Amino acid sequence: SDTAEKAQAIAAARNTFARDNPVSAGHHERARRSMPGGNTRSILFHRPFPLVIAQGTGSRFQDVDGHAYVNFLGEYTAGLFGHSHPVIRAAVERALAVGLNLSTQTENEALFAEAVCDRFPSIDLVRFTNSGTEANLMALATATAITGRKTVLAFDGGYHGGLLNFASGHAPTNAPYHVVLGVYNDVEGTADLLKRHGHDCAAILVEPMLGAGGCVPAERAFLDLLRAEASRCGALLIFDEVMTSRLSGGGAQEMLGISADLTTLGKYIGGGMSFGAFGGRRDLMERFDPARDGAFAHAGTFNNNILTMSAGHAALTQIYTRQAASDLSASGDRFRANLNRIAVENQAPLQFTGLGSLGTIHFSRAPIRSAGDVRAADQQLKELFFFHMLRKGIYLAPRGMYALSLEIADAGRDAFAEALADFIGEQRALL
Amino acid sequence: SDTAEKAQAIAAARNTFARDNPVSAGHHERARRSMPGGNTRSILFHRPFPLVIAQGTGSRFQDVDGHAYVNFLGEYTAGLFGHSHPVIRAAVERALAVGLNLSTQTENEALFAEAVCDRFPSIDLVRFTNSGTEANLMALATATAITGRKTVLAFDGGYHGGLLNFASGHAPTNAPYHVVLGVYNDVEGTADLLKRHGHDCAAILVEPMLGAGGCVPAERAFLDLLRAEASRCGALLIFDEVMTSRLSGGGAQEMLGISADLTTLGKYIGGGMSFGAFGGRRDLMERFDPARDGAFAHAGTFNNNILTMSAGHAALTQIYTRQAASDLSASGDRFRANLNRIAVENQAPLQFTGLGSLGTIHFSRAPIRSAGDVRAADQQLKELFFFHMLRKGIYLAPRGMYALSLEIADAGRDAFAEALADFIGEQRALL
Ligand SMILES: Cc1ncc(COP(=O)(O)O)c(CN[C@@H](CC(=O)O)c2ccccc2)c1O
Ligand SMILES: Cc1ncc(COP(=O)(O)O)c(CN[C@@H](CC(=O)O)c2ccccc2)c1O
């Protein structure tokens, strides 16, 4: 499906971006001297070079060349509060007043843990980590240590952190858990794998919607299979809700009425501060009670850091309440529906998939149900879309994902929709 | 070596602590409802229950019962700046002004990376993570992916993070890397292991001084063996300098004139914000250049977060300069020497081991060279010491470790020394 016409368009788009952004280009050359590819977070890199941002307030930011954008990326769902939320700021100020690096417990960690347990229906007890990666690693540590088993079932296209990256199948850098990969949403194939491996299965690890892998919702039949089979064979079902937890007050599990044995959390819950968490069934999580004989150990210098504890409690109780989550997801559904309406109205061979305030463009009108479907959609048009949106002052992920923050308003949503319509018109010959 | 007299003393000490701290006791009972054992960082727990701290400024903090302490723990070496450092505060303010969760690169990450590369002599390129745990996992990911080998040599008593905890040998929660454990400082035994396993050795992972494992310096012969054997067999030598990096401007490697292939960093370098890093030889780290064919992936939501980037650059360039590191280590050496002088003057069967500003008490006058030596020292007296120091308004780790912050001054050092002398006098019958 790769064509020379599209490759020529991409070359032209990259060239225009380069010409537009010489200050960012200068930054990149300098950054390469201290970091591999001038990079410390792989997903931030794109050709010909990434933007460097100077400053941002609310939903807007400005690059080092002075161009302004509305930020539709929202820190891959962590940046729910925009760039300068006054309640987050107040929480940071309160944290400084309590004191940094106090080397001890404060009440703030307990208050934050209570806020998490209150709203997530399957989390009876929780522990905080410093990232979604650590949360998922600790969930696997819990499952393997409790069951004494080695096999982990996960899914092709699934992303669970820097050491558990299955976005393109097995990565040589992944931690060497014995992972068997299924096809997302594939009931019969997955049922077969669970017949074969169920006996040695410590855990099933699954996102209720592929996040990085394309905003691909799980189907109920698929999740029902995993819940029934985990219970049958004695594996722990782990829902990775690092992204999906935002979709309702109680995440995907509240929406579905399906409870995982363990749940991992990340992104926005710490108020935009470093954050992850793992929690779940009381009888599983109690294995970490340090007063218990044979307790599992889980240290971590910054687990209880005052900034995350303070900003996280503010995030859940003062800003993104359960009602706020319902409201934002409804807003996101209307937004996604409008984008899809624009595509249909214009006979465009594209769609936006997702749930609530999360969505990704795919250049296909086939059902998008697994990693294979995402990969089969037109990747060249996806790149062209990214550069087009940038030229229109709209910033979203290179991979075509948006994650609406609470600061996105009518003006931003209107601008996105108009820019989409303009893309369809201007790139008609390639569509 | 356990006696009933010491057990009775411990029971009495725990009872006195409980009576002194009923508000902390009340907090603990509530915390148990949301976190396993009311805990989110295992090392913070101790019997009968841990203190809850209300507030701190500089080197001092106050518990929820109103008692004041000087903080000699210093966040297990991360809390180098005390509780309210004005330069860290200024950096946090600057970070808020730049904007939170900007979803893009800023110049701040490059400036911070430059500061790291400038002072650490074996780090040609660096990438930031969210914890020392992630840094060490990524170092192992790098070594195994580059070499195509599976075996990792590490050491009994070694601590490399929540998924790489060898403090008490193999932990069932550890990530399932194929780890072979040697005895720290054991040249002949380790040489034997490297003859057996060298061919399949992806990495040797070692702290230049056991940190959590007792502030036990590595001997030069031991480190020379590892450097020679890693080079001979093609394994990557990884120095875990998460704690030791503070000991000079260029960490232990500058002090030793031995260069590791990869170095991991953590703790204070991010200004007390969430932080880890892995760096090392250019040709190894370039494998992460995202523009390269077959690049290794290393994402992480908070890797480049503006608070860590800002406070970290301030930490290294405005506060804890290379000269500041030399000065603090010299201060720490004088402090440790004074503690040891007090022990010798009083014929006390105890010593403080360590380097620079890091030290741990051991109730033995035997050489402390490996995990076995630390474990063989009197553990009951160690517990008694912790409670004694608390009663004197001096806070250090339950395990008897201090990590001097830049805010520790004459008054605090004098109080510690006097409290040590008082312990020796008051507990004479047990010594
Ligand atoms: C579903 C999911 N689970 C875990 C993670 C890991 O969380 P941390 O990044 O906090 O360790 C993630 C992270 N998604 C982001 C990470 C980023 O660098 O923004 C990501 C990763 C790869 C591609 C796109 C986005 C999840 O999403
Ligand atoms: C030498 C060393 N390497 C790695 C780590 C892991 O760093 P993170 O805690 O940032 O993931 C550490 C951590 N040491 C502390 C952790 C804490 O919770 O304070 C620790 C752990 C266990 C016992 C005592 C101190 C290293 O020290």
mmCIF file of N, CA and C in Angstrom, chain B residues 98-183:
data_model
loop_
_atom_site.group_PDB
_atom_site.id
_atom_site.type_symbol
_atom_site.label_atom_id
_atom_site.label_comp_id
_atom_site.label_asym_id
_atom_site.label_seq_id
_atom_site.Cartn_x
_atom_site.Cartn_y
_atom_site.Cartn_z
ATOM 1 N N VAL B 98 7.764 27.026 33.350
ATOM 2 C CA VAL B 98 7.939 26.397 32.039
ATOM 3 C C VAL B 98 6.634 25.685 31.658
ATOM 4 N N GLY B 99 6.061 24.956 32.608
ATOM 5 C CA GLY B 99 4.811 24.254 32.353
ATOM 6 C C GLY B 99 4.951 22.769 32.605
ATOM 7 N N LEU B 100 3.913 22.196 33.208
ATOM 8 C CA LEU B 100 3.883 20.774 33.528
ATOM 9 C C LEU B 100 3.295 19.939 32.394
ATOM 10 N N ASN B 101 3.780 18.702 32.278
ATOM 11 C CA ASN B 101 3.207 17.708 31.352
ATOM 12 C C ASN B 101 3.077 18.219 29.913
ATOM 13 N N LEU B 102 4.140 18.877 29.446
ATOM 14 C CA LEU B 102 4.166 19.531 28.138
ATOM 15 C C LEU B 102 4.165 18.563 26.953
ATOM 16 N N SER B 103 4.350 17.271 27.227
ATOM 17 C CA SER B 103 4.159 16.217 26.220
ATOM 18 C C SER B 103 5.185 16.221 25.099
ATOM 19 N N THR B 104 6.312 16.898 25.343
ATOM 20 C CA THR B 104 7.317 17.185 24.341
ATOM 21 C C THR B 104 8.646 17.360 25.066
ATOM 22 N N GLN B 105 9.725 17.417 24.297
ATOM 23 C CA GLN B 105 11.038 17.724 24.851
ATOM 24 C C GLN B 105 11.149 19.191 25.202
ATOM 25 N N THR B 106 11.898 19.494 26.266
ATOM 26 C CA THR B 106 12.295 20.875 26.524
ATOM 27 C C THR B 106 13.809 20.898 26.571
ATOM 28 N N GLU B 107 14.375 22.088 26.465
ATOM 29 C CA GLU B 107 15.816 22.256 26.589
ATOM 30 C C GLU B 107 16.351 21.767 27.936
ATOM 31 N N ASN B 108 15.502 21.800 28.956
ATOM 32 C CA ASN B 108 15.918 21.444 30.314
ATOM 33 C C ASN B 108 16.474 20.026 30.440
ATOM 34 N N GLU B 109 15.902 19.092 29.688
ATOM 35 C CA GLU B 109 16.405 17.726 29.732
ATOM 36 C C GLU B 109 17.828 17.628 29.160
ATOM 37 N N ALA B 110 18.107 18.377 28.089
ATOM 38 C CA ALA B 110 19.449 18.394 27.499
ATOM 39 C C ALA B 110 20.470 19.045 28.434
ATOM 40 N N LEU B 111 20.080 20.145 29.080
ATOM 41 C CA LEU B 111 20.973 20.820 30.030
ATOM 42 C C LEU B 111 21.313 19.914 31.214
ATOM 43 N N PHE B 112 20.311 19.204 31.722
ATOM 44 C CA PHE B 112 20.516 18.238 32.808
ATOM 45 C C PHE B 112 21.438 17.091 32.366
ATOM 46 N N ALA B 113 21.204 16.556 31.166
ATOM 47 C CA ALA B 113 22.039 15.471 30.625
ATOM 48 C C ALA B 113 23.494 15.913 30.473
ATOM 49 N N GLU B 114 23.691 17.141 30.004
ATOM 50 C CA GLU B 114 25.034 17.728 29.934
ATOM 51 C C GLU B 114 25.693 17.806 31.306
ATOM 52 N N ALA B 115 24.932 18.208 32.328
ATOM 53 C CA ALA B 115 25.479 18.306 33.684
ATOM 54 C C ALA B 115 25.924 16.934 34.211
ATOM 55 N N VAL B 116 25.137 15.908 33.907
ATOM 56 C CA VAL B 116 25.482 14.540 34.290
ATOM 57 C C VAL B 116 26.743 14.082 33.555
ATOM 58 N N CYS B 117 26.761 14.236 32.233
ATOM 59 C CA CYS B 117 27.917 13.783 31.446
ATOM 60 C C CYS B 117 29.204 14.513 31.831
ATOM 61 N N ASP B 118 29.096 15.805 32.144
ATOM 62 C CA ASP B 118 30.269 16.608 32.511
ATOM 63 C C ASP B 118 31.019 16.052 33.711
ATOM 64 N N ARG B 119 30.286 15.618 34.726
ATOM 65 C CA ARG B 119 30.974 15.260 35.957
ATOM 66 C C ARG B 119 31.219 13.777 36.169
ATOM 67 N N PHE B 120 30.482 12.906 35.476
ATOM 68 C CA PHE B 120 30.705 11.465 35.626
ATOM 69 C C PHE B 120 31.590 10.963 34.494
ATOM 70 N N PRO B 121 32.830 10.565 34.832
ATOM 71 C CA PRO B 121 33.902 10.382 33.844
ATOM 72 C C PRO B 121 33.701 9.227 32.854
ATOM 73 N N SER B 122 32.871 8.244 33.199
ATOM 74 C CA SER B 122 32.642 7.106 32.301
ATOM 75 C C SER B 122 31.288 7.172 31.592
ATOM 76 N N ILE B 123 30.536 8.240 31.843
ATOM 77 C CA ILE B 123 29.225 8.418 31.211
ATOM 78 C C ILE B 123 29.362 9.371 30.026
ATOM 79 N N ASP B 124 29.375 8.798 28.819
ATOM 80 C CA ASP B 124 29.487 9.566 27.564
ATOM 81 C C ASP B 124 28.124 10.051 27.095
ATOM 82 N N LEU B 125 27.117 9.209 27.332
ATOM 83 C CA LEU B 125 25.716 9.519 27.024
ATOM 84 C C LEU B 125 24.868 8.950 28.149
ATOM 85 N N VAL B 126 23.720 9.580 28.402
ATOM 86 C CA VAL B 126 22.865 9.188 29.516
ATOM 87 C C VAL B 126 21.393 9.226 29.096
ATOM 88 N N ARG B 127 20.582 8.387 29.732
ATOM 89 C CA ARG B 127 19.118 8.479 29.634
ATOM 90 C C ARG B 127 18.538 8.476 31.040
ATOM 91 N N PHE B 128 17.469 9.249 31.229
ATOM 92 C CA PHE B 128 16.816 9.374 32.531
ATOM 93 C C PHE B 128 15.676 8.394 32.684
ATOM 94 N N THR B 129 15.534 7.883 33.902
ATOM 95 C CA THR B 129 14.437 7.001 34.272
ATOM 96 C C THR B 129 13.752 7.628 35.481
ATOM 97 N N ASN B 130 12.798 6.900 36.065
ATOM 98 C CA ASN B 130 12.011 7.420 37.183
ATOM 99 C C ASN B 130 12.400 6.896 38.555
ATOM 100 N N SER B 131 13.457 6.083 38.590
ATOM 101 C CA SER B 131 13.907 5.448 39.824
ATOM 102 C C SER B 131 15.221 4.724 39.557
ATOM 103 N N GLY B 132 15.968 4.458 40.627
ATOM 104 C CA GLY B 132 17.146 3.586 40.545
ATOM 105 C C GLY B 132 16.807 2.175 40.072
ATOM 106 N N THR B 133 15.637 1.679 40.477
ATOM 107 C CA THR B 133 15.136 0.371 40.016
ATOM 108 C C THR B 133 15.041 0.315 38.492
ATOM 109 N N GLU B 134 14.400 1.316 37.887
ATOM 110 C CA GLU B 134 14.303 1.368 36.424
ATOM 111 C C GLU B 134 15.665 1.506 35.762
ATOM 112 N N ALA B 135 16.555 2.292 36.367
ATOM 113 C CA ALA B 135 17.891 2.483 35.799
ATOM 114 C C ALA B 135 18.638 1.150 35.712
ATOM 115 N N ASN B 136 18.610 0.373 36.797
ATOM 116 C CA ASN B 136 19.296 -0.920 36.818
ATOM 117 C C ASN B 136 18.639 -1.949 35.898
ATOM 118 N N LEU B 137 17.303 -1.966 35.856
ATOM 119 C CA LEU B 137 16.600 -2.812 34.885
ATOM 120 C C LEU B 137 16.999 -2.485 33.443
ATOM 121 N N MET B 138 17.083 -1.194 33.119
ATOM 122 C CA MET B 138 17.469 -0.768 31.769
ATOM 123 C C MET B 138 18.925 -1.093 31.473
ATOM 124 N N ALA B 139 19.782 -1.003 32.485
ATOM 125 C CA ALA B 139 21.177 -1.426 32.307
ATOM 126 C C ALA B 139 21.267 -2.918 31.975
ATOM 127 N N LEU B 140 20.490 -3.734 32.685
ATOM 128 C CA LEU B 140 20.428 -5.163 32.370
ATOM 129 C C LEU B 140 19.800 -5.426 31.001
ATOM 130 N N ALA B 141 18.746 -4.673 30.655
ATOM 131 C CA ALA B 141 18.143 -4.762 29.317
ATOM 132 C C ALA B 141 19.178 -4.475 28.228
ATOM 133 N N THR B 142 20.002 -3.458 28.462
ATOM 134 C CA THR B 142 21.055 -3.078 27.528
ATOM 135 C C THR B 142 22.091 -4.195 27.377
ATOM 136 N N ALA B 143 22.579 -4.711 28.506
ATOM 137 C CA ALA B 143 23.628 -5.735 28.502
ATOM 138 C C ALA B 143 23.165 -7.033 27.841
ATOM 139 N N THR B 144 21.978 -7.502 28.217
ATOM 140 C CA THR B 144 21.431 -8.734 27.643
ATOM 141 C C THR B 144 21.095 -8.574 26.154
ATOM 142 N N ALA B 145 20.488 -7.449 25.775
ATOM 143 C CA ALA B 145 20.148 -7.226 24.366
ATOM 144 C C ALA B 145 21.383 -7.081 23.471
ATOM 145 N N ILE B 146 22.413 -6.392 23.958
ATOM 146 C CA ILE B 146 23.653 -6.216 23.187
ATOM 147 C C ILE B 146 24.443 -7.525 23.054
ATOM 148 N N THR B 147 24.619 -8.240 24.164
ATOM 149 C CA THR B 147 25.466 -9.442 24.184
ATOM 150 C C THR B 147 24.748 -10.685 23.677
ATOM 151 N N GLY B 148 23.419 -10.684 23.760
ATOM 152 C CA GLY B 148 22.616 -11.857 23.437
ATOM 153 C C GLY B 148 22.727 -12.942 24.494
ATOM 154 N N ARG B 149 23.313 -12.594 25.643
ATOM 155 C CA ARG B 149 23.548 -13.541 26.738
ATOM 156 C C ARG B 149 22.536 -13.355 27.854
ATOM 157 N N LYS B 150 22.415 -14.367 28.712
ATOM 158 C CA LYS B 150 21.380 -14.376 29.751
ATOM 159 C C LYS B 150 21.870 -14.246 31.191
ATOM 160 N N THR B 151 23.117 -14.621 31.467
ATOM 161 C CA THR B 151 23.554 -14.698 32.857
ATOM 162 C C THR B 151 24.024 -13.343 33.385
ATOM 163 N N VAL B 152 23.615 -13.037 34.614
ATOM 164 C CA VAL B 152 24.027 -11.816 35.306
ATOM 165 C C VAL B 152 24.703 -12.217 36.603
ATOM 166 N N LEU B 153 25.933 -11.749 36.797
ATOM 167 C CA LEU B 153 26.618 -11.943 38.069
ATOM 168 C C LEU B 153 26.339 -10.741 38.958
ATOM 169 N N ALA B 154 25.793 -11.012 40.138
ATOM 170 C CA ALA B 154 25.601 -10.004 41.168
ATOM 171 C C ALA B 154 26.056 -10.598 42.498
ATOM 172 N N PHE B 155 25.859 -9.861 43.589
ATOM 173 C CA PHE B 155 26.430 -10.252 44.868
ATOM 174 C C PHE B 155 25.438 -10.291 45.995
ATOM 175 N N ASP B 156 25.563 -11.327 46.823
ATOM 176 C CA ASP B 156 24.761 -11.490 48.022
ATOM 177 C C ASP B 156 24.914 -10.257 48.916
ATOM 178 N N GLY B 157 23.783 -9.703 49.339
ATOM 179 C CA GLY B 157 23.769 -8.434 50.054
ATOM 180 C C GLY B 157 23.555 -7.233 49.144
ATOM 181 N N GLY B 158 23.701 -7.439 47.837
ATOM 182 C CA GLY B 158 23.541 -6.356 46.857
ATOM 183 C C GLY B 158 22.086 -5.938 46.725
ATOM 184 N N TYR B 159 21.859 -4.639 46.557
ATOM 185 C CA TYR B 159 20.500 -4.135 46.359
ATOM 186 C C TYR B 159 20.462 -3.212 45.146
ATOM 187 N N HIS B 160 19.631 -3.563 44.168
ATOM 188 C CA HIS B 160 19.611 -2.835 42.898
ATOM 189 C C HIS B 160 18.215 -2.367 42.511
ATOM 190 N N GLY B 161 17.279 -2.477 43.450
ATOM 191 C CA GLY B 161 15.922 -1.995 43.221
ATOM 192 C C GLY B 161 14.879 -3.020 43.603
ATOM 193 N N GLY B 162 13.611 -2.631 43.478
ATOM 194 C CA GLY B 162 12.496 -3.481 43.919
ATOM 195 C C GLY B 162 12.380 -4.805 43.173
ATOM 196 N N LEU B 163 12.917 -4.860 41.958
ATOM 197 C CA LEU B 163 12.871 -6.085 41.155
ATOM 198 C C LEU B 163 14.233 -6.789 41.119
ATOM 199 N N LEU B 164 15.214 -6.230 41.824
ATOM 200 C CA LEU B 164 16.594 -6.741 41.802
ATOM 201 C C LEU B 164 17.183 -6.647 43.207
ATOM 202 N N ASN B 165 16.489 -7.311 44.124
ATOM 203 C CA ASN B 165 16.790 -7.242 45.533
ATOM 204 C C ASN B 165 17.511 -8.527 45.950
ATOM 205 N N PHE B 166 18.810 -8.417 46.234
ATOM 206 C CA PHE B 166 19.612 -9.569 46.659
ATOM 207 C C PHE B 166 20.119 -9.401 48.093
ATOM 208 N N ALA B 167 19.455 -8.518 48.839
ATOM 209 C CA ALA B 167 19.878 -8.169 50.197
ATOM 210 C C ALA B 167 19.881 -9.388 51.114
ATOM 211 N N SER B 168 18.965 -10.315 50.845
ATOM 212 C CA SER B 168 18.868 -11.565 51.592
ATOM 213 C C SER B 168 18.901 -12.759 50.640
ATOM 214 N N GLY B 169 19.745 -12.678 49.613
ATOM 215 C CA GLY B 169 19.786 -13.699 48.563
ATOM 216 C C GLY B 169 18.662 -13.500 47.557
ATOM 217 N N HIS B 170 18.267 -14.570 46.875
ATOM 218 C CA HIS B 170 17.215 -14.479 45.858
ATOM 219 C C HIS B 170 15.846 -14.229 46.490
ATOM 220 N N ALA B 171 15.127 -13.243 45.965
ATOM 221 C CA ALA B 171 13.779 -12.919 46.439
ATOM 222 C C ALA B 171 12.808 -13.443 45.392
ATOM 223 N N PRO B 172 11.686 -14.056 45.825
ATOM 224 C CA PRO B 172 10.773 -14.651 44.848
ATOM 225 C C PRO B 172 10.090 -13.605 43.956
ATOM 226 N N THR B 173 10.096 -12.353 44.397
ATOM 227 C CA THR B 173 9.522 -11.246 43.626
ATOM 228 C C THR B 173 10.494 -10.639 42.597
ATOM 229 N N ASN B 174 11.767 -11.034 42.619
ATOM 230 C CA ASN B 174 12.712 -10.457 41.655
ATOM 231 C C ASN B 174 12.345 -10.762 40.211
ATOM 232 N N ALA B 175 12.599 -9.818 39.304
ATOM 233 C CA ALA B 175 12.440 -10.104 37.881
ATOM 234 C C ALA B 175 13.348 -11.294 37.544
ATOM 235 N N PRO B 176 12.854 -12.235 36.718
ATOM 236 C CA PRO B 176 13.502 -13.536 36.511
ATOM 237 C C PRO B 176 14.726 -13.527 35.591
ATOM 238 N N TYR B 177 15.577 -12.507 35.718
ATOM 239 C CA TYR B 177 16.902 -12.561 35.107
ATOM 240 C C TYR B 177 17.645 -13.774 35.667
ATOM 241 N N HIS B 178 18.488 -14.384 34.842
ATOM 242 C CA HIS B 178 19.278 -15.519 35.314
ATOM 243 C C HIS B 178 20.456 -14.980 36.111
ATOM 244 N N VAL B 179 20.254 -14.838 37.413
ATOM 245 C CA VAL B 179 21.258 -14.212 38.272
ATOM 246 C C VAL B 179 22.011 -15.259 39.077
ATOM 247 N N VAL B 180 23.336 -15.178 39.014
ATOM 248 C CA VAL B 180 24.213 -15.978 39.850
ATOM 249 C C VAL B 180 24.788 -15.035 40.905
ATOM 250 N N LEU B 181 24.665 -15.407 42.178
ATOM 251 C CA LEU B 181 25.168 -14.569 43.271
ATOM 252 C C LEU B 181 26.515 -15.027 43.822
ATOM 253 N N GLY B 182 27.450 -14.084 43.876
ATOM 254 C CA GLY B 182 28.731 -14.284 44.556
ATOM 255 C C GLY B 182 28.727 -13.673 45.941
ATOM 256 N N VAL B 183 29.853 -13.804 46.636
ATOM 257 C CA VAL B 183 30.071 -13.169 47.926
ATOM 258 C C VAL B 183 30.829 -11.865 47.684
#
